[PDB]
Amino acid sequence: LEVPFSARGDRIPDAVAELRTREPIRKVRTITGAEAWLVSSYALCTQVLEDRRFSMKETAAAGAPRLNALTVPPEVVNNMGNIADAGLRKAVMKAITPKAPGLEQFLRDTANSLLDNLITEGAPADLRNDFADPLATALHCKVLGIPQEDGPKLFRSLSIAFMSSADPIPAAKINWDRDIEYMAGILENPNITTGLMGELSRLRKDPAYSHVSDELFATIGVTFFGAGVISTGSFLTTALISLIQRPQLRNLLHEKPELIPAGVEELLRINLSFADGLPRLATADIQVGDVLVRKGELVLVLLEGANFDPEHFPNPGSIELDRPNPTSHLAFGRGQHFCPGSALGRRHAQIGIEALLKKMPGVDLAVPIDQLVWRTRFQRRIPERLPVLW
């Protein structure tokens, strides 16, 4: 049994439910040919993510079994850990909340501006390349304090940076080195005084951060831009497809926009944007279900396994806005490495959806759904284009 099962992100394979039933932890083979334990039940997914003995940091260890080839320097795997040790965690998290003044208004204006141009241009429109991704890019430029016109350049690295490859990718290092050099220049730029890079540039000259390397400062910039843009852009794209497939829900959210956060939360739960399970390495012998995971073995946490688990989410395929456990999904992960951009991710989706439902209430696919081209061997499930009419 080889993972991943399908690059299609518009429907979950029937095999996932069967697997969760029969073998909630199963030996699979990754694209690199390595063994791994695939966990697909909510209970066991939660257990793994809340046990730090299943380590993220150690997934980059030498000779360790691999989900896929590294496309970043080995130390980037422990990036949030290095941020914490350098005493920068509070500052970073503050810089990436949607609660920043003028941020939500910027998202709203940007989303409306993008949609107005699509309408002016006329159907069909590509909701990924000309809405979801540009909105994600524009947002993270604003969050970092870097020029808007620098966005598309940094975005270009992402079709390679987030590949899920069996072998090392020569272009990944080339792009990484280039983007690092860009962020280093930003730190030296006196004009950059706002956002994440503005604050980092400030802390860089502060005595209490004298021994925090310039490497880490630039790395934070590159990492948060790439991870944030790819995650919010891809999720919003696949969420829009979920809405298109659900006219009844669309109208309801259109009619009662206060329900949109609860809707986005359900869209998060059923979202299939993650193409691979979350990788962890066992730093000890740990019992997981019917399996004793040995030290040094690779464990993959299948997010849709847990999120479509009927034992935790009854009628998992249905979007229900009144669930008693609405945010208990694992779309933002769980435990030590819970997504620091979760609130920003929610707000990006909510504002993008609200604007679209206002501007395009009759939005629908301009092509048969099977005509969507799903990107292969990639860390996200996305259609190359999302053609719509309205």
Residues found near ligand HEM in the complex (CB under 6 A): 56, 80, 96, 224, 227-228, 231-232, 235, 278, 331-333, 337, 339-341, 344-345
Closest by Cα among 267, 250, 243, 240 to 326: 267
Query: What minimum distance in Å lies between the beta carbon of 365 and ligand 69S?
Result: 27
Between 103 and 222, CB nearer to ligand 69S = 222
**From CA 361, how far away is CA 351, in angstroms rounded?**
15
Q: Which residues contact 352 (CB under 8 A, 6 or more apart)?
A: 107, 111, 131, 132, 135, 236
**From CA 242, how far away is CA 247, in angstroms rounded?**
10
Gapped junctions in the chain, after residues (C–N > 2.5 Å): none
C-alpha separations of 248 from 73, 138, 268 in Å:
46, 31, 18
Query: What minimum distance in Å lies between the beta carbon of 107 and ligand HEM?
Result: 12
What residue ranges bind ligand 69S (CB under 6 A)? Answer: 70-73, 75-76, 79, 161-162, 168, 172-173, 176-177, 222-223, 225-227, 231, 339, 379
Query: What minimum distance in Å lies between the beta carbon of 108 and ligand HEM?
Result: 17
Query: What minimum distance in Å lies between the beta carbon of 228 and ligand 69S?
Result: 6
The site partner of 172 among ligand 69S, ligand HEM, none (C-beta below 5 to 8 Å per kind) is ligand 69S
Query: What minimum distance in Å lies between the beta carbon of 162 and ligand 69S?
Result: 5
Between 253 and 267, CB nearer to ligand 69S = 267
Between 32 and 112, CB nearer to ligand 69S = 32
Between 79 and 110, CB nearer to ligand 69S = 79
Between 344 and 363, CB nearer to ligand HEM = 344
The site partner of 201 among ligand 69S, ligand HEM, none (C-beta below 5 to 8 Å per kind) is none
The site partner of 161 among ligand HEM, ligand 69S, none (C-beta below 5 to 8 Å per kind) is ligand 69S
Query: What minimum distance in Å lies between the beta carbon of 378 and ligand 69S?
Result: 10
Contact of 182 with 213, CB cutoff 8 Å: no
The site partner of 340 among ligand 69S, ligand HEM, none (C-beta below 5 to 8 Å per kind) is ligand HEM
Contact of 241 with 387, CB cutoff 8 Å: no
Query: What minimum distance in Å lies between the beta carbon of 384 and ligand HEM?
Result: 20
The site partner of 73 among ligand 69S, ligand HEM, none (C-beta below 5 to 8 Å per kind) is ligand 69S
Between 222 and 349, CB nearer to ligand 69S = 222
The site partner of 232 among ligand HEM, ligand 69S, none (C-beta below 5 to 8 Å per kind) is ligand HEM
The site partner of 344 among ligand HEM, ligand 69S, none (C-beta below 5 to 8 Å per kind) is ligand HEM
Query: What minimum distance in Å lies between the beta carbon of 292 and ligand 69S?
Result: 28
The site partner of 242 among ligand 69S, ligand HEM, none (C-beta below 5 to 8 Å per kind) is none
Query: What minimum distance in Å lies between the beta carbon of 296 and ligand 69S?
Result: 20
**From CA 140, how far away is CA 156, in angstroms rounded?**
14
C-alpha separations of 265 from 107, 269, 330 in Å:
19, 6, 11
Between 163 and 220, CB nearer to ligand HEM = 220
Between 32 and 245, CB nearer to ligand 69S = 32
User: For residue 196, what are its two tokens?
Assistant: 């994440």
Contact of 178 with 206, CB cutoff 8 Å: no
Ramachandran assignment for 123, one of left (phi > 0), alpha (psi -120 to 50 degrees), beta (any other): beta
The site partner of 76 among ligand HEM, ligand 69S, none (C-beta below 5 to 8 Å per kind) is ligand 69S
